[PDB]
Symmetry: C2
Subunit: 219 residues, 2 copies
């Protein structure tokens, strides 16, 4: 009857879900949980999601948890505002961009991961690899955006941008200065940051919290 979504601030998988709902204009109920207070580990969550993770989503009797699965279900259940074009060939490219975004987590966020799981423990001999790998990954997306001149997969907003943008917003959040090193991504970020649905779904805790600044040196 009416989708309900349990989610938390700062979580790209949660953001993906909110963006799809907003873009498709679907009315939904929500429960903003507290990560710092471990509410994603509550019994109400576990009943619906034995992994005790967010997002956890329900829609009538339907219950779905994996962020990507939720997005796919919403696109299929509410076809009114399609986040995929109709041409099968073009759709293939949207799917390609969507799933390729996972490489950003691995190749880029690992630079932020390492600068924490053992910080104050120099190893710039290897650290060079990671930072360099982050630059290589970003290069791909820089090119993609350069090629489209608009969004990440086509000249129109699609499911691919739902997956991509949150990752870019997170990167900027960590203090990355993309203006001159990655002009197209920066331009993409600025355009998207002005999109009403994105404005509505910015992570609530970022406004009053300081940027961790783990990518201030990325460049």
């Amino acid at each position: 009857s009416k989708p309900f979504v349990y989610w938390g601030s700062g979580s790209p998988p949660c953001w993906k879900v909110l963006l799809v709902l907003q873009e498709k204009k679907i009315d939904y109920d929500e429960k903003i949980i507290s990560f710092s207070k471990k509410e994603h580990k509550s019994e109400e969550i576990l009943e619906l999601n034995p992994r005790g993770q967010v997002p956890t989503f329900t829609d009538g009797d339907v219950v779905v948890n994996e962020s990507t699965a939720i997005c796919m279900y919403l696109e299929e259940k509410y076809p009114k505002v399609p986040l995929f074009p109709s041409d099968t060939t073009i759709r293939a490219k949207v799917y390609q961009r969507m799933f390729e975004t996972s490489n950003i987590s691995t190749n880029v966020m690992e630079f932020v991961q390492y600068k924490m799981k053992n910080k104050d423990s120099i190893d710039q001999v290897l650290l060079k690899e990671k930072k360099d790998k982050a630059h290589v990954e970003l290069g791909h997306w820089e090119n993609y955006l350069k090629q489209t001149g608009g969004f990440v997969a086509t000249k129109e907003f699609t499911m691919a941008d739902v997956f991509f943008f949150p990752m870019v917003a997170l990167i900027v959040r960590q203090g990355a200065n993309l203006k001159d090193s990655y002009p197209n991504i920066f331009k993409y970020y600025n355009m998207m940051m002005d999109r009403p649905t994105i404005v509505k779904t910015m992570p609530p805790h970022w406004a009053e919290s300081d940027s961790p600044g783990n990518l201030l040196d990325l460049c």
Copy 2:
């Protein structure tokens, strides 16, 4: 006109693609590359896939690389033999299982990862965590299979099994003894191993190569 797939032995993302093609009975051309000889890094591959990875797939003018994207494209382009049921609610569960399989790589394969990236370097204090985490992850799937009594998402073979099985076959390949600890997964594995399409797509190099045996102690 006729799909063409570049792929390598032992790669779950490649296996996923071959299974979809075989299950849907789509006729395709193929180029079996050599990982040990770095043919996935060839110029012919790079032209199609700048990441120099496999699987790389083409179908006429369409070019798609991400394994999941390839599978989605095939399901959409060749609807004759659907790997998804028609009911949107049930499809949601198939999507859920498909994407949740990624946790197996992270929670289970990490036990195999660690027992290599720094083997002969005891740390059973932490090692306990990893092994234990692998058991927790497998528990979920044990339950799922217990609940269905058949396949991983429903009582019918679906896209979810395409994603799941390769990961289980890999686990067994590493020497896991699931018979008594995870009876339903073992039963699932045996049934699937007898499925003609799986028989046809077993990783070619496994027959004459010894099992790495990194999960012989998992139990």
